[PDB]
Design a protein around this nucleic acid. Structure first.
Ligand SMILES: [Zn+2]
Ligand SMILES: [Zn+2]
Ligand SMILES: [Zn+2]
Ligand SMILES: [Zn+2]
Length: 111
DNA sequence: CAGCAGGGGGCGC
DNA sequence: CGCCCCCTGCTGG
């Protein structure tokens, strides 16, 4: 396949090789028409443009909610509409938390 | 919890 | 190749 002479990243595609170079060169973006924000991937600039519009194409099929991202919509389904969900214990504490996002910020200021 | 973006991979065109 | 989605930290109410 293809290789990266910087971080030893491999990918079978040429476009995904240039996408990895955006993370090393820094800026290869376009610009935003309303806040001058600049994102490398063309898709992320499209979801940034979704911030300034009431476009929420992701709907919760249960409570008919609306979200700007599928993953954000996915979390709402996971923590608010499912009961028997596997929570996570702390490797150095005796508390139990739901999300890894909470686990990441927990170890930041607790450990 | 939600909102947000950064780093990928899947998959059709 | 190009569009969308995935999981991932991160932040504030
Ligand atoms: Zn690299
Ligand atoms: Zn903007
Ligand atoms: Zn819901
Ligand atoms: Zn802990």
């Amino acid at each position: 396949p293809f290789k990266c002479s910087m971080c030893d990243y491999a990918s079978v595609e040429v476009s995904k090789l240039k996408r990895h170079i955006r993370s090393h060169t820094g800026e290869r973006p376009f610009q935003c028409s309303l806040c001058s924000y600049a994102s490398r991937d063309t898709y992320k600039l499209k979801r940034h443009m979704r911030t300034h519009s009431g476009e929420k194409p992701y709907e919760c099929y249960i409570c008919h909610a609306r979200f700007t991202q599928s993953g954000t919509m996915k979390m709402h389904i996971l923590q608010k509409h499912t009961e028997n969900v596997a929570k996570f214990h702390c490797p150095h504490c005796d508390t139990v938390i739901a999300r890894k996002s909470d686990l990441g910020v927990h170890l930041r200021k607790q450990h």
